[model samples]
Target: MLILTRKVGESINIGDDITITILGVSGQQVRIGINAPKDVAVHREEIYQRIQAGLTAPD
Candidate 1:
């Protein structure tokens, strides 16, 4: 895993579509917002994992 040190107003871009912005920093709690463009699908960690796993056939 990659780790980076960032403050508020800082951004990390993924390709040209998904851009993450550091919204606020309050001690251990932080708000990192994601910018999703048109025709894009954004899902949280667990839901996305479920979506991916949904593709596999259950025996």
Candidate 2:
């Protein structure tokens, strides 16, 4: 895994389209913002795992 540190408002580009930004940080939680095309899929790890296990369908 490639972990990184970024300050608020800083971003990392993924390929040519997706951009992940650091929105805020508190004592233990961090907020993120993502910019991507409509066709792309994004999910938290647990939710993604559920999808992979067929517990839910992609919308």
Candidate 3:
């Protein structure tokens, strides 16, 4: 695991296809931008949980 810090507009790279950027932050909220191949899987944790439950819905 890596623990680091970045300023607004700064970016971090992962492997050769992923880039994580700090777009802006204010009022205790941080805005992030992730750039990756379309085939990659990425989403907010809460949203992912909702998706999991949605898929399991029996209706």
Candidate 4:
């Protein structure tokens, strides 16, 4: 994995479209924002893994 360092307000671009920003930080917690097209799907890491593993809780 590639490692990067970014402070608040800094962003990194992916491909030609997506942008990830470092929004804020508190102790060890971090806040981030992603800029992407509406067609793109975004998921939190744990939730994404859960869905990929066929785990669902809705009827």
Candidate 5:
């Protein structure tokens, strides 16, 4: 895995395409913006996992 640091207003481009920006930050919160192709699916990881788990939930 590759990791890098970015300050507010800075951005990183992936695959020479998508861009991720560090917009604002507060004590324990961060704001980000992402520019990517429409085909890409982005969702909060924890919430996505929960939804998937619920699909197989027992009654």
Candidate 6:
């Protein structure tokens, strides 16, 4: 994984279009903002992992 340090309001770009921003931080919790086209499906980590598991399951 690529480690990065970003303060609030700083953003990291993905590919040609998507941008993920650090919105806020409170104690151990963090808030994030994402900007992407409608065609992209952004899922939380757990949900995305579950979806991956389902796709790889044997019939």
lDDT of 2 by residue, 1-59 (tens): 88887898899999998999988888799999889989988989988888788755557
Error of 2 at 43 (Å): 0.1
Clashes of each: 0, 0, 0, 0, 0, 0
Q: Which pairs, if any, clash in model 3? A: none
Q: What would the TM-scores of all predictions be?
A: 0.65, 0.81, 0.77, 0.78, 0.72, 0.78
Report the Cα RMSD per candidate.
Answer: 3.8, 2.8, 2.7, 2.9, 3.8, 3.1
- 2 versus 6: better lDDT goes to: 6
Name the runs in model 2 displaced over 4 angstroms: 55-59
| RMSD to native, candidate 2 | 2.8
Candidate 6 to truth, TM: 0.78
Better of 2 and 4 by TM-score: 2
Error of 4 at 5 (Å): 0.6
lDDT for model 1: 0.86
Model 4, position 28: C-alpha lDDT score = 88
lDDT, candidate 4, 1-59, per-residue tens? 88998998899998797999998898888999999988877789987887789666677
The most accurate candidate by TM-score is 2
lDDT per residue as tens, model 3, 1-59: 89998999999999999999999998799999999999887889998888777686577
Q: What overall lDDT goes with each candidate model?
A: 0.86, 0.87, 0.91, 0.87, 0.85, 0.91
RMSD of 3: 2.7
Pairs that clash in candidate 4? none
lDDT of 6 by residue, 19-51 (tens): 999998998999999999899889899999988
lDDT (Cα) of model 6: 0.91
Model 6, backbone clash pairs (residues 3+ apart or across chains), number: 0
Show where candidate 3 strays beyond 4 Å: 53-59
Give a tens-digit lDDT track for model 5, residues 1-59. 99998999899989876889999898799999989888876668897797777675677
